[PDB]
């Protein structure tokens, strides 16, 4: 894999869980967290820094360009397919 991740980190899991979920109207920050914690229960540590880092990793995802957050945290996460305007 090109630029392969060392492991399935938050950024990686949040990414893949999104398409793996039903189209719907995207994937809620709620449902995404529910999916990853449930599915990756025997893989994701979920020791203590899950709740905080989950959202923090989502912040990386929105900056990434792949994830879009129209209404931000109080908004259902949606897949983006257009890079945000780069300020010269």
UniProtKB/Swiss-Prot annotation:
<comment type="similarity">
    <text>Belongs to the histone H1/H5 family.</text>
</comment>
<protein>
    <recommendedName>
        <fullName>Histone H1</fullName>
    </recommendedName>
</protein>
<feature type="modified residue" description="Phosphoserine">
    <location>
        <position position="4"/>
    </location>
</feature>
<feature type="domain" description="H15 2">
    <location>
        <begin position="6"/>
        <end position="81"/>
    </location>
</feature>
<comment type="function">
    <text>Could act as an H1-type linker histone. Has been shown to bind DNA.</text>
</comment>
């Amino acid at each position: 894999k090109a630029s392969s991740p060392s492991s399935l980190t938050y950024k990686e899991m949040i990414l893949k869980s999104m398409p793996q979920l039903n189209d719907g109207k995207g994937s809620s920050r709620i449902v995404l967290k529910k999916y990853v914690k449930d599915t990756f229960s025997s893989k994701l540590k979920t020791s203590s820094n899950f709740d905080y880092l989950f959202n923090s990793a989502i912040k990386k995802c929105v900056e990434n360009g792949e994830l879009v957050q129209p209404k931000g945290p109080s908004g259902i996460i949606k897949l983006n397919k257009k890079k945000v305007k780069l300020s010269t």
